[PDB]
Amino acid sequence: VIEHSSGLKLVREWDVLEQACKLTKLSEIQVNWVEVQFYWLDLYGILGENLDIQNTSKFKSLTSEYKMITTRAFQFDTTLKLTIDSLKMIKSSLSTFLERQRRQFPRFYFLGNDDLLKIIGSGKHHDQVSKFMKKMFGSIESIIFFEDSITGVRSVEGEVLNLNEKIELKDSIQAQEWLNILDTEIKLSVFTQFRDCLGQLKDGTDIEVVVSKYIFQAILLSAQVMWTELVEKCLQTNEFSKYWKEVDMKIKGLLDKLNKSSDNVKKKIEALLVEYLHFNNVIGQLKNCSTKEEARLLWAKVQKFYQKNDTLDDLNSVFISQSGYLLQYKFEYIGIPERLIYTPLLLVGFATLTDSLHQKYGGCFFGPAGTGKTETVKAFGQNLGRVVVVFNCDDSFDYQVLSRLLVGITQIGAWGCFDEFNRLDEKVLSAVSANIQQIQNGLQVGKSHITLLEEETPLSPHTAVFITLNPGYRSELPENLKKSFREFSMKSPQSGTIAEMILQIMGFEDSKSLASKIVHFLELLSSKCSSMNHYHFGLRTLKGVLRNCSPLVSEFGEGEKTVVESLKRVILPSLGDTDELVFKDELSKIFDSSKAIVQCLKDAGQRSGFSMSEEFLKKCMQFYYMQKTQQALILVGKAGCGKTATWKTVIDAMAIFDGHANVVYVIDTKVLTKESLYGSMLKATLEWRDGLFTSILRRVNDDITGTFKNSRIWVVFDSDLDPEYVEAMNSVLDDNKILTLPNGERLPIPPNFRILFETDNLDHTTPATITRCGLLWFSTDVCSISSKIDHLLNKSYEALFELDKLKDLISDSFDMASLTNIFTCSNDLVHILGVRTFNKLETAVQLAVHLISSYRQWFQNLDDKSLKDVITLLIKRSLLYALAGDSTGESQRAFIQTINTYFGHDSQELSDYSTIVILSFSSFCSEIPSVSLEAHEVMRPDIVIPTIDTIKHEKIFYDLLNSKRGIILCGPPGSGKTMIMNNALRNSSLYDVVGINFSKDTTTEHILSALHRHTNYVTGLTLLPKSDIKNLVLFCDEINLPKLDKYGSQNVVLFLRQLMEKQGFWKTPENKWVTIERIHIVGACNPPTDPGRIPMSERFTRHAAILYLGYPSGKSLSQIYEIYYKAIFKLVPEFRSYTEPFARASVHLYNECKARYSTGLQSHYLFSPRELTRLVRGVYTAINTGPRQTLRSLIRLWAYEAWRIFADRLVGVKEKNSFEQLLYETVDKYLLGNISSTSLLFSGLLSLDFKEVNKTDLVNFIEERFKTFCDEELEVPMVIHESMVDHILRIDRALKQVQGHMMLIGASRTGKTILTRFVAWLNGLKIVQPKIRHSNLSDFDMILKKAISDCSLKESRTCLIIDESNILETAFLERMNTLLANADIPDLFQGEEYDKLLNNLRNKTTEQELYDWFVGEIAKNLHVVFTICDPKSSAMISSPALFNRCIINWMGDWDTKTMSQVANNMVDVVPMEFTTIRDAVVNILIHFDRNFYQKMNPRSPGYFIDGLRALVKLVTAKYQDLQENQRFVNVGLEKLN
Amino acid sequence: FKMIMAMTMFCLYKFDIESEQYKEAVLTMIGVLSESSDGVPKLTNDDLRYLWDYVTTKSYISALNWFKNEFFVDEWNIADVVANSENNYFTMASERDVDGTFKLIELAKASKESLKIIPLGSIENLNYAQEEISKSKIEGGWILLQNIQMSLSWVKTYLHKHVEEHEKFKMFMTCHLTGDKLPAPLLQRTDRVVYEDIPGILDTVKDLWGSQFFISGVWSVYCTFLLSWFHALITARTRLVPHGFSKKYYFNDCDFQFASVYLENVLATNSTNNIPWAQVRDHIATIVYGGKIDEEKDLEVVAKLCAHVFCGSDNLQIVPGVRIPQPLLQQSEEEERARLTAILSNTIEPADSLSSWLQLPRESILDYERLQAKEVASSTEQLLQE
Ligand SMILES: Nc1ncnc2c1ncn2[C@@H]1O[C@H](COP(=O)(O)OP(=O)(O)OP(=O)(O)O)[C@@H](O)[C@H]1O
Ligand SMILES: Nc1ncnc2c1ncn2[C@@H]1O[C@H](COP(=O)(O)OP(=O)(O)O)[C@@H](O)[C@H]1O
Ligand SMILES: Nc1ncnc2c1ncn2[C@@H]1O[C@H](COP(=O)(O)OP(=O)(O)O)[C@@H](O)[C@H]1O
Ligand SMILES: Nc1ncnc2c1ncn2[C@@H]1O[C@H](COP(=O)(O)OP(=O)(O)O)[C@@H](O)[C@H]1O
C-alpha cells in the first residue's frame, strides 16, 4: 500500500483479487473499488484543489463525498454502497453540467472534459484560456491582456487584433459569458475593420499606406470586393488596360515594400501578393478574350465577392458569387496563413464545391495522394472566412472524438473536413457514416434538430461536411454516403503555374525560365532515376525547396545560382550514387552549372583522430548546410557505413566554430521500452512515471543550470525506425513542437533541441515522416582503408622513447601496395555470418597493437632484424585471425600460405603452429600437456583433453579478449563451443564466467539479474564487477535463439551492441547514464542456415570479432579418444595394451558414418563427437557394471553399445546390414562372433551385472514382471513380441545410463508411452503425469522443483512423462535444450530458492562442491522422454543440445511379423475355429490394409487394435447369444419329445 | 452467364445423344467463335449450314440467340419464377445503373398485392422497416427493401436474426452485383433472381418524362427536354464497357437533379435571347457530368457529346432521324409540353441505334460484339475441358 500526495492510501494489488473472485458480493466490491479510485483520481485532480468549482447542489455533494472519502481514508458495506451511488449520481450531474456548459458556448465542445474543467476552475486566474485558445479556435495563439481587460488576440502566425472596444473583467464572472462577448466582438471587430478598409479603398486611398494598418482579412475582403466591383464596371464596357496597369503598379509597389519589411509585414505582403497575382491573372485572361460571351464565361467561373448594401444586419452583409451560386461570408478571423496559389484547377475545385454546397450536399475528393485536396479544402474555407477543422485521419482516431468534433462542427457551423477517410476501422467508419448521413438528412430537409449521440442538438443552416479519399490503395465512398455526396477527381496539380507564382513572389527577376526549368528537372528526376521507396519528386519537395531558397537568396543573390544551390542542398542528400551521377548530368544539361568552415571541419577531424577524405568532407559539408535549417535530420547508410564519426565531427567542428557548448546524449530507442522512455498510467495505484525522454525534455526546458541558454543540445537515436516509436514523436517532428504525453501534461520545445535519427535502412518507414524531416543518405563507405588503419593506430596508441619508434616501425610494416592486394584477395573467401572487408580492420589492428604492447618489454635487448621478424609474424597472425577467422581450416591453410606470400620470402614465415617466445621461434606442438584422468570422472561432462587446436584456440582467445574486443563464436554443432569456453575460462586467472542461455523469448532483465550477483554499483554512475582484480566477462551461448520483432529486428542483440560499442546505457527507473569499465562479452552461436535460426544484424556483429569453430581433425579426435580408452582401460589390466587400435577403429567408423550419410534424407542424420562421447560412457558403465570380461566379450559389448547408440535412426534394413558389415570389417581389420541386434542381448534384469542372458530367461522375466504388474497396479491386457522386447531392451539400456536421455519415433497407439511407463516401473522410477492448458511455466517449475527436492531429500526414484501435447511453445524446447546440454540451468535457481536449496544440501550432507554434487545427482536421476509422431520439432534434432545426449531410437510402426504375433496371441483366447483359418483371416486383413493404404510415412495401427477388439467382443457376444438360443431350442425339443 | 450456362447444357446434351461428327462441328464452331482455329467442319445438316452462314456473315450474337431459340423452346420471366416458389423470400439483384423497383411495382399492380417501398438508412429508416415487416407479418403484403447494400451490417444483424408463416406473405430485397459480398445464409435461403433491362433509349426517355412533372417559361421545359435527352444518350453510351468509355461509370438520377437545378438557375437569372450555351456546356462537361471522369479521352468524348447536344443552333439533330424545333416567342408551356411529347412519339428507333443514336462508327460496335463473342467462347472452351 502506498499513499498519494494527501489523505487516502492506495493498495498495490490488482487483478489478483479479480482472479481469486472469478462471489456476487465480491464482484460488487471490486466494481465499487475500481469506480471509487478511477473517479477519486479526477476528484483529487480537479475537485480537491480548486475552490471556485466547489463554492450549488453539486458543490455540496462534492463536499459530502470529500468528507466520506476522508473518513474512508481514516478507516461498511452500506457505506460503500452509498459512495458508489453518490459517485454515479455526481458523474451524471457533472456530465450534464459539462454538456449544458458546452451548450452555452458551443466552441467549448471541442475540448476534453478535463480541459474544460480546468478552464471553468480558472475563475479568477483569467489566463488559463490563453494556452488553450489555439485548440479552441484554430488560428489564435494567445489573448493579450491590458490591465485586467482584453484589447487584442494573438494569431498563431503572430498577428494582434486591434479590437473596437475593450472588455472589463469583473470578479463574479465565468469564462463562458465573457468569451461569448469576446468572439461576438471578434466578428464585429473584423467587420468594422473590413468596412473602414473598404471605405478607404473606395475613397482612393493607396494600397501601400493601408497595408501596414489593418489585419489580413479586412484588407483581403476589401481588395477582393473593390476588384470585383471595378472589374464588373469595366466589363460592362470593352476596356481592360487601365485596371490591368493599376493592378500591375499595385503589385510592383507591394513588392517594393516587401523588400523593406519586418516579419508579420512580410507575411501580410506575401499573402496580398498572392491575391493580387491572382487578380492580374484573371484580368489578363479576360483581356485575351475576343468576344463578349466567352468573357462572361471566364468571369463566371472566377470567384466573385459581393456586399449587401441594403440589409442592415452586418454579419451576413457580404456574399460570394461563383457560377451563379451564392455563398454568404461569416466573418470569422483566420489570421495570416499561407495562401494557395490560384490555378485553373483550383478554380474548378472551388466551382464544384460551390455546386455541392448550393443544394444542401457535400463535396468529395479522391485520386492520387500528394495532390492538393485537404489544402484546397482549407483554402476554400479561408476564402469563405471560416476556419475548417481538418481531421488527420489515422489509426489514432476513434469513435468518441470524431463524434464530439462532428457535433461541434454541426453546432458551431464550422465545416468539418476529412483527410484520408479510407484510413478508418470498419465499425468506426460505419458509425461516422451513419452520423454523416443523418447530418446530410437534416441539412436537406432543413430540420432544426438532428437526433444524434442520444440527444437533440441544434443545427445551424451553414454547416457542412467535406471528405477526401484515396481509393484502390482501398475503397470509394460507401453507398449510404454515395447517395448524398458529389464525387470529384483532382488528379493534376498545375505545378507550372505554382512555381511561376512562387518565383514571382520571392522577388526573382525571371520566374518563367526558373519555373519551367525546375518543373522539367523534377519530372526528369522522377522518371530517370531508380524507383527507391524513399524518393518523392512531386510538389511537396518543390515547395520545400522554394521555401528553403530564401537564406541562399540573402547570401548569394537572386538567380539560377540560388536555385541550383538549393537543389544541391536539399534533394541530393537523399539520393543514392547512380541517382547522384544522373542528378549531376541533368544539372549540367539543364542549368548553367567560405573555406573557414572547411578549415574548422579539417581541424576538428585532425584533433579527433579521424582523417579527412574528399567525399567525407563533401558529405560533412552537406550535413552542416542541411542542419543549418531543419530541426530533425535522419542519416542513413549501410551497416558500418561510418555516420557516427561524421555527426560527432560536425558537432565538435561547430563547437569550435560558434563557441556554444555542445551537449549530446546517445539513446537506443528500440531496446528502451515506450513506458521507460515516456511513461504510463499504473493499473495498481494509477501513478505516472517520468520517462527518460520526458526527463531529458524537462531538464533541457527548465534551464535551471543555465547551460541550455548558451548551448546546443542533441539527442541521437542509433537504431531503426519503429513506426509506433515515431507516432509518439510526430508532434515534436511537426511544426507544433509541443510534447504529447498520455497523462495530460504538455512540454515545450526550444529551437536548439535538434533530434537525430541514426539508422541503416528505411524498410518500415512511412513516407509521410521522411517529408516532414530531412533525409541524408550515405551510399558509399566514408573512408579509405589506409585512413581507417591510421585512425585506428592513433586511437590504439592513445588507449595505452619506445612509442614513436614503435609507431614508425609499425607504419613501415603496413605498406599499402601489399595491403590492397591481400584485402582484395581476402574479399572473395568463404565467410560465415558474413562481414564486409571494411570492418575487420579494427580487430586486426587492435590484436596486432596489443601483441606489440605485450611484447614491448623485451625489444630493448633485441636487434632490429629479430624485432622486425617478431612484429611481422604477429601482424601476419593478426591478419589471419581477423580475416580468415570466418572460414574453414583448409581455407585457413590457404590463407596462411597467401599471407606468407604477399609479404615476400625475406620476412619471417608464418607457420600453422607458429609461436613467438623468448627472442626466437617456437612451436605449439610441444606445448600440449599430458593429462591422465582416471575412470571415476570420464562421465563428468566438463573434462577437456587438450590438443594442438585446443591450445591454439585458447591462446588466440586470451590474445583477442585481452585486445579489448568482442567474441562471437560460430561453427557447426559439436565443436565444443561451451567446452572450449569452460576450458579457456575456468582455468583462467584474470577472468570469471557468468552463464546465460538464450531461449526463443529472452528479456533484457534476465541478463541484468544474472550479472547482478557478480557486479557492484559505484557512484549507479559506474558499474564494476563484485571482484576487484579479475575482469568479469559475460558468456552467452545459442545467442541466435531470441525471436525477431515485427519490423525485422531483435532487441536483445541490440542491447548487447549497446553494451559493447557505447560502453554504457541508461538504467530504467532512474534514467541515469551508466558506465562500464572492465566487462567484456563473449558469444557462441550456430550458423544461420540451421532451421530455427535467424541472421543477426551486421550492425551488432560488426563491433565484435568473429571466430569460426569447425569440426576437429580425425587425428585430433583419435588422440583424444585414445586418451579416453587408456583412462577407461585403467580399470581392466589384461587389455591395457589394446588402447590405440580401438580408438582408431572408433574414429574410422565415425568417419565413414559421417561421410556415407547426407542430412537431406533424414533430419536426424547429423554427426558430431557427442555420440562418440556417449559411446565411451556406455562402454564405461557396461564395464563397471559387468563381470570379468574377455577380449571377445569386450568386442561384442562394444558392438552392442555401437548398435544401441549409433544404429537407431535408420529407415530400413539395408543400412543396418551395412553397419553390421562395417563393424565386421573394423573388428577384423583393427584389433568372429555374430554382431546382429538379436545376437547382442546384453542386459542386467536377470543377474547382478550387465551381461548376455538367455532369450527364454529374459522373456520369462518380462512375463513374470508383466503378470505381477497386472496383479498389483493396473489390469492392462497387453501382449509381448520381439520388436517391443528389443525396444524395451534399448530403452532400459538408455535408462540405466546416467544422464543419457532418449527419444522414440512411432505412430499413435504404438505403445511408446506404455513401454516407457512399464520400464519406469521395472527400474523403479516413479512416474508423474502433467495435467497440461490451465498451467504455465510457473506451475511447471514449481512441480519440477518439488520433485527434484523430494528426489534429492528422500532418495526417491523420480522421472517425468512428457507428451508432445504437453509441450506447446519453443520456450519449453529451449528449456529442455539447456537441461540436456548443462545440468544446472542458471535462471531457475537464484535468490530465496537458491538459499533454501543450499541450506537443505548443507543439512543433508563448499558452495562449489555442493553445486557440483547437485549437477551429479540431477544427471544421475533425471530422464525425460520425447515423443514425435510427425517426422515445430523438426529442427530440434538439428539443435546440438537436444542431440547432445538423447538416444534417437526408431521405434516405428508395427511390421508384418509383429502384427502376426499380436493377432495370433490375441485371437488365441476366444474360440473361433469352427469351419487353420486364423492365419488366413489375419493375412487377408493385413493384405487389405496394405492395398488400402497404397491406394490412399508410417501406418497408424489404431485401426488394427480397434478392429481386433471390436471383432473379438462382437464374436463373443454373438456366439453367447447363439449358444443361448441353441440351448433353448434343444430344451424345447427335449420337452416336446 | 445465362448464355454460358445455356451453351454448356446444350453441349452436354448434344455430345451424348449424337455422334462424334457433331462434336467435332461444335468444337470447330466454338474455335472459330474464339478466333482460335480455322477450319471448315465436315458438313453433311440445315441448322449447321445456317450456323456457317451466320459466322461467315460475322453476326455473332445472331448465331448465339439462334442457338438459344433452336435448342431451347421456352423462357422464364420474373412472373413465372415468382409464381412457382416453395419459399416466400426473394432477393432481387441488379446493377447500380439499372433500377428494379418499377418492375416490382408493375408486378404488384398485376398481382393486386400491396407493395411497400422501404429504402433503408438511418435509425428512423430501420424503425420504419421494422414496423412495415411487423405489419406484413401480422396481416400480409409485399415488402420491398430498396438498395440494402448501404446498410449491409444492419441487414446482417436484423434480417438474419428475423429469419433465424402468414398466408400470401412475400418480401423482396435489392442489392447491386458490383457491391459487397453478401453472407452465405442470405444467398441460399432465398430464390435468387436478377433483372437485365434492355437498353430502351426511347423507353427510358418516356419513363423520365413521366417521372418528372414539367419553372421559367418555354425555355425551361425545352432545356429540360434537351438535358433529359443528353442524359439518356450518355447512359446508353456508358453500357459499352470497352468502347463507349474506357471505364464503366454509373450516372444516376442525382446527377440529373443537379444538372436540372443548374439549368433552372441559369435560365432564371438569364431569360434573354442569348442564352449562355457555352457556360452551361462547360459547367455540365466539367463539374456536373465531368465530376467522376479523370482520363483525358473520356473528357474529350463527353465534351464532344455536349457540343453536339447543347449547341443550340438553328436546327438540331440529336439522332439522324428526328429534329427539334425550338419553342418560338408566343408559345405557352402546356402546348409546348404536348408538342415535345408528340415529337417524342413521332420518333421511331432504327435497329442500328447503338451505332447511330450514340455517334459511333459501325466498326466499333462490330469490334465490341467480336470481343464479347471471344470472351464467351473462351469461357465455354475453359468450361468444357472438365
Ligand atoms: N576520417 C576517418 N578516418 C578513419 N576512420 C574513420 C573516419 N571517419 C569515420 N571512420 C570510422 O568509421 C566508423 C564510424 O562508425 P559508424 O558511424 O559506422 O557507427 P554506427 O553508428 O555504430 O554504425 P551502424 O549504424 O552501421 O551500426 C568508425 O569505426 C571510425 O573509425
Ligand atoms: N495552390 C496549390 N495548389 C495545389 N496544391 C498545393 C497548393 N499549395 C500547396 N499545395 C500542396 O498540396 C499538398 C496537399 O496535399 P494533400 O492533398 O493534403 O495530400 P494528402 O491528401 O495525401 O494528405 C500540400 O502538401 C502542398 O504542398
Ligand atoms: N577437442 C575436444 N576435446 C575433448 N572433448 C571434445 C572435443 N571436441 C568435442 N568434444 C566432446 O564433444 C562434446 C561437445 O559438446 P558441445 O559442442 O559443447 O555442445 P553444445 O555446442 O551443444 O554446447 C563434449 O561432450 C565433448 O566431450
Ligand atoms: N500391442 C497392443 N495391443 C493392444 N493395445 C495396445 C497395444 N499397444 C498399445 N495399446 C493401447 O494403446 C493405449 C495407449 O497407447 P499410447 O501409449 O498412446 O501409444 P503411444 O505411446 O505409441 O502413442 C493403451 O491403453 C493400450 O490399450
Short mmCIF file of N, CA, C and O in Angstrom, two decimals, chain A residues 293 296-297 300-301 323-326 348 351-352 355-356 358-359 361 366 430 434 437-438 441 479-480 482-483 485-489 491, chain B residues 96 121-122 125 147 149-150 153 176 253-255 257-258 261-262 265 270 274 276 278-279 282-283 286-294:
data_model
loop_
_atom_site.label_atom_id
_atom_site.label_comp_id
_atom_site.label_asym_id
_atom_site.label_seq_id
_atom_site.Cartn_x
_atom_site.Cartn_y
_atom_site.Cartn_z
N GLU A 293 -19.37 36.79 -74.94
CA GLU A 293 -19.91 35.64 -74.23
C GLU A 293 -18.80 34.78 -73.62
O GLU A 293 -18.97 34.24 -72.53
N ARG A 296 -17.85 36.61 -70.50
CA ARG A 296 -18.78 36.31 -69.42
C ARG A 296 -18.56 34.90 -68.89
O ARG A 296 -18.70 34.66 -67.68
N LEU A 297 -18.22 33.97 -69.77
CA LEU A 297 -17.88 32.62 -69.34
C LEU A 297 -16.69 32.64 -68.38
O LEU A 297 -16.75 32.05 -67.29
N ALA A 300 -17.48 34.20 -65.10
CA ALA A 300 -18.44 33.48 -64.27
C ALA A 300 -17.78 32.42 -63.41
O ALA A 300 -18.24 32.15 -62.29
N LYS A 301 -16.70 31.80 -63.90
CA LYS A 301 -16.05 30.75 -63.13
C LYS A 301 -15.20 31.31 -61.99
O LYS A 301 -15.14 30.72 -60.91
N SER A 323 -20.34 30.98 -60.28
CA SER A 323 -21.11 30.23 -61.28
C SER A 323 -22.61 30.30 -61.02
O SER A 323 -23.33 29.31 -61.13
N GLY A 324 -23.08 31.48 -60.63
CA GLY A 324 -24.49 31.68 -60.39
C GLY A 324 -24.98 31.21 -59.04
O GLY A 324 -26.15 31.42 -58.72
N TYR A 325 -24.13 30.57 -58.24
CA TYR A 325 -24.49 30.16 -56.89
C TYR A 325 -23.89 31.14 -55.90
O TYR A 325 -22.84 31.73 -56.14
N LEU A 326 -24.58 31.32 -54.78
CA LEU A 326 -24.27 32.42 -53.88
C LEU A 326 -23.99 31.86 -52.49
O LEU A 326 -24.82 31.13 -51.94
N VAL A 348 -11.63 25.25 -60.62
CA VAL A 348 -12.57 24.16 -60.87
C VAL A 348 -12.97 23.49 -59.56
O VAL A 348 -14.14 23.15 -59.36
N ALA A 351 -15.40 25.72 -57.91
CA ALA A 351 -16.70 25.66 -58.56
C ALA A 351 -17.48 24.41 -58.17
O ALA A 351 -18.68 24.48 -57.87
N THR A 352 -16.81 23.25 -58.17
CA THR A 352 -17.54 22.03 -57.82
C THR A 352 -17.91 22.01 -56.34
O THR A 352 -18.96 21.47 -55.99
N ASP A 355 -21.05 24.18 -56.20
CA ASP A 355 -22.21 23.42 -56.67
C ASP A 355 -22.66 22.41 -55.63
O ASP A 355 -23.87 22.22 -55.43
N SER A 356 -21.72 21.74 -54.98
CA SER A 356 -22.09 20.76 -53.96
C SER A 356 -22.77 21.44 -52.78
O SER A 356 -23.76 20.92 -52.25
N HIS A 358 -24.38 24.32 -52.73
CA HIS A 358 -25.56 25.12 -53.03
C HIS A 358 -26.84 24.38 -52.66
O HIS A 358 -27.77 24.98 -52.12
N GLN A 359 -26.89 23.08 -52.94
CA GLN A 359 -28.11 22.30 -52.81
C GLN A 359 -28.08 21.35 -51.62
O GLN A 359 -28.55 20.22 -51.70
N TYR A 361 -25.76 19.62 -50.06
CA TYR A 361 -24.99 18.40 -50.20
C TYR A 361 -23.59 18.63 -49.63
O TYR A 361 -23.33 19.63 -48.96
N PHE A 366 -11.20 12.29 -54.38
CA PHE A 366 -10.48 11.03 -54.40
C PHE A 366 -9.52 11.05 -55.57
O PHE A 366 -9.71 11.79 -56.54
N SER A 430 -18.47 2.80 -40.04
CA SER A 430 -19.92 2.64 -40.09
C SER A 430 -20.62 3.67 -39.22
O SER A 430 -21.63 4.27 -39.63
N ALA A 434 -23.08 6.65 -40.54
CA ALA A 434 -24.45 6.90 -40.10
C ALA A 434 -24.62 8.33 -39.62
O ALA A 434 -25.63 8.98 -39.93
N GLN A 437 -24.57 10.67 -42.67
CA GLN A 437 -25.83 10.52 -43.40
C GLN A 437 -26.96 11.23 -42.68
O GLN A 437 -27.78 11.90 -43.32
N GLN A 438 -27.02 11.12 -41.35
CA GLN A 438 -28.05 11.82 -40.59
C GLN A 438 -27.88 13.33 -40.70
O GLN A 438 -28.87 14.07 -40.77
N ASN A 441 -29.09 14.37 -44.00
CA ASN A 441 -30.55 14.26 -43.94
C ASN A 441 -31.16 15.48 -43.28
O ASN A 441 -32.17 16.02 -43.75
N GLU A 479 -22.20 3.40 -50.06
CA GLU A 479 -23.40 3.82 -50.78
C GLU A 479 -24.24 4.78 -49.96
O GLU A 479 -24.84 5.73 -50.50
N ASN A 480 -24.29 4.58 -48.64
CA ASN A 480 -25.10 5.43 -47.78
C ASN A 480 -24.63 6.87 -47.80
O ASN A 480 -25.42 7.79 -47.57
N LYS A 482 -22.78 7.76 -50.71
CA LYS A 482 -22.75 7.99 -52.14
C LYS A 482 -24.07 8.52 -52.67
O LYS A 482 -24.10 9.15 -53.73
N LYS A 483 -25.17 8.28 -51.96
CA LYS A 483 -26.44 8.87 -52.35
C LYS A 483 -26.53 10.35 -52.01
O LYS A 483 -27.39 11.05 -52.56
N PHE A 485 -23.66 12.79 -51.81
CA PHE A 485 -22.40 13.50 -51.99
C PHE A 485 -22.10 13.64 -53.47
O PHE A 485 -22.70 12.98 -54.31
N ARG A 486 -21.16 14.53 -53.78
CA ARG A 486 -20.73 14.78 -55.15
C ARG A 486 -19.26 14.40 -55.28
O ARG A 486 -18.38 15.13 -54.81
N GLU A 487 -19.00 13.27 -55.93
CA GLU A 487 -17.63 12.84 -56.12
C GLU A 487 -16.92 13.75 -57.12
O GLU A 487 -17.55 14.41 -57.94
N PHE A 488 -15.60 13.78 -57.03
CA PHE A 488 -14.81 14.63 -57.90
C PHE A 488 -13.38 14.10 -57.91
O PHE A 488 -12.95 13.44 -56.97
N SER A 489 -12.67 14.38 -58.99
CA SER A 489 -11.29 13.92 -59.13
C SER A 489 -10.39 15.10 -59.46
O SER A 489 -10.68 15.88 -60.38
N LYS A 491 -6.80 15.17 -60.05
CA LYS A 491 -5.58 14.38 -60.20
C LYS A 491 -4.35 15.22 -60.51
O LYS A 491 -3.23 14.83 -60.15
N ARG B 96 -26.05 -1.16 -60.35
CA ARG B 96 -26.39 0.18 -59.88
C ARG B 96 -26.80 1.12 -61.00
O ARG B 96 -27.32 2.20 -60.71
N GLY B 121 -31.70 3.09 -44.31
CA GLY B 121 -30.99 4.31 -44.00
C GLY B 121 -30.68 4.45 -42.53
O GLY B 121 -30.08 3.56 -41.92
N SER B 122 -31.07 5.57 -41.94
CA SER B 122 -30.77 5.87 -40.55
C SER B 122 -31.62 4.99 -39.63
O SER B 122 -32.34 4.09 -40.07
N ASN B 125 -35.16 5.01 -40.56
CA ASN B 125 -35.47 4.10 -41.65
C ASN B 125 -35.52 2.65 -41.17
O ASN B 125 -36.35 1.86 -41.63
N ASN B 147 -32.16 -1.04 -52.20
CA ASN B 147 -30.73 -0.76 -52.05
C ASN B 147 -30.25 -1.04 -50.62
O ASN B 147 -29.82 -0.15 -49.89
N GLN B 149 -27.65 -2.57 -49.82
CA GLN B 149 -26.19 -2.66 -49.74
C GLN B 149 -25.62 -1.58 -48.82
O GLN B 149 -24.64 -1.82 -48.11
N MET B 150 -26.24 -0.39 -48.81
CA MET B 150 -25.78 0.71 -47.97
C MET B 150 -25.95 0.44 -46.48
O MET B 150 -25.36 1.16 -45.67
N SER B 153 -24.41 -4.07 -42.72
CA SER B 153 -24.33 -4.53 -41.33
C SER B 153 -25.71 -4.57 -40.69
O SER B 153 -26.03 -5.51 -39.94
N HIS B 176 -26.87 -4.69 -55.31
CA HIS B 176 -26.11 -4.45 -56.52
C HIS B 176 -25.03 -5.52 -56.66
O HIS B 176 -24.37 -5.87 -55.67
N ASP B 253 -29.88 9.31 -61.06
CA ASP B 253 -30.87 10.38 -61.03
C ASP B 253 -30.36 11.62 -60.32
O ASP B 253 -30.80 12.73 -60.65
N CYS B 254 -29.45 11.46 -59.36
CA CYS B 254 -28.96 12.61 -58.61
C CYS B 254 -28.19 13.57 -59.51
O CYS B 254 -28.30 14.80 -59.37
N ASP B 255 -27.41 13.02 -60.44
CA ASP B 255 -26.71 13.85 -61.41
C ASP B 255 -27.69 14.64 -62.27
O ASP B 255 -27.47 15.82 -62.56
N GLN B 257 -30.63 15.54 -61.27
CA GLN B 257 -31.20 16.55 -60.38
C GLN B 257 -30.31 17.78 -60.32
O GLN B 257 -30.79 18.91 -60.43
N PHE B 258 -29.00 17.57 -60.15
CA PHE B 258 -28.09 18.71 -60.07
C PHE B 258 -27.99 19.45 -61.40
O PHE B 258 -27.97 20.69 -61.42
N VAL B 261 -31.18 21.55 -61.69
CA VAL B 261 -31.16 22.73 -60.84
C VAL B 261 -30.24 23.79 -61.42
O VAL B 261 -30.59 24.98 -61.44
N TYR B 262 -29.08 23.38 -61.93
CA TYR B 262 -28.17 24.35 -62.53
C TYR B 262 -28.78 25.03 -63.75
O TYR B 262 -28.66 26.25 -63.91
N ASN B 265 -31.44 27.51 -62.64
CA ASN B 265 -30.91 28.73 -62.05
C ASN B 265 -30.20 29.59 -63.09
O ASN B 265 -30.15 30.81 -62.95
N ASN B 270 -31.16 34.50 -66.41
CA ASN B 270 -30.90 34.93 -67.78
C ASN B 270 -31.99 34.35 -68.67
O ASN B 270 -31.92 33.18 -69.05
N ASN B 274 -29.86 35.62 -75.94
CA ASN B 274 -28.57 34.94 -76.00
C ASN B 274 -28.37 34.16 -74.70
O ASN B 274 -27.75 34.63 -73.75
N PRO B 276 -26.57 31.63 -72.39
CA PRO B 276 -25.15 31.26 -72.40
C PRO B 276 -24.93 29.77 -72.57
O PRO B 276 -24.68 29.05 -71.60
N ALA B 278 -22.48 28.18 -74.01
CA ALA B 278 -21.12 27.75 -73.71
C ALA B 278 -20.91 27.55 -72.22
O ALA B 278 -20.23 26.60 -71.81
N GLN B 279 -21.51 28.41 -71.39
CA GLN B 279 -21.31 28.30 -69.95
C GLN B 279 -21.96 27.03 -69.40
O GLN B 279 -21.33 26.28 -68.65
N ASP B 282 -19.86 23.92 -70.66
CA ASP B 282 -18.65 23.62 -69.90
C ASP B 282 -18.97 23.22 -68.47
O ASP B 282 -18.31 22.34 -67.91
N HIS B 283 -19.98 23.85 -67.86
CA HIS B 283 -20.31 23.53 -66.48
C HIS B 283 -20.80 22.09 -66.35
O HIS B 283 -20.47 21.41 -65.37
N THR B 286 -17.62 19.59 -67.18
CA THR B 286 -16.50 19.52 -66.24
C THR B 286 -16.90 19.22 -64.81
O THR B 286 -16.14 18.58 -64.10
N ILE B 287 -18.07 19.67 -64.38
CA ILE B 287 -18.46 19.67 -62.98
C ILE B 287 -19.64 18.74 -62.72
O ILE B 287 -19.62 17.93 -61.80
N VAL B 288 -20.69 18.86 -63.53
CA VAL B 288 -21.88 18.04 -63.33
C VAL B 288 -21.62 16.61 -63.78
O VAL B 288 -21.64 15.67 -62.98
N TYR B 289 -21.34 16.42 -65.07
CA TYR B 289 -21.08 15.10 -65.61
C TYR B 289 -19.60 14.76 -65.69
O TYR B 289 -19.26 13.59 -65.86
N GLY B 290 -18.73 15.75 -65.59
CA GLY B 290 -17.30 15.52 -65.57
C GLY B 290 -16.72 15.33 -64.19
O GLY B 290 -15.49 15.30 -64.05
N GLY B 291 -17.56 15.21 -63.16
CA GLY B 291 -17.05 15.08 -61.81
C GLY B 291 -16.30 13.79 -61.58
O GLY B 291 -15.21 13.79 -60.99
N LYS B 292 -16.83 12.68 -62.05
CA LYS B 292 -16.23 11.38 -61.80
C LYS B 292 -15.24 10.96 -62.88
O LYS B 292 -14.71 9.85 -62.81
N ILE B 293 -14.96 11.83 -63.84
CA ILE B 293 -14.16 11.50 -65.01
C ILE B 293 -12.76 12.08 -64.83
O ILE B 293 -12.61 13.28 -64.57
N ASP B 294 -11.74 11.24 -64.98
CA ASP B 294 -10.36 11.67 -64.83
C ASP B 294 -9.52 11.53 -66.09
O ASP B 294 -8.63 12.35 -66.31
#
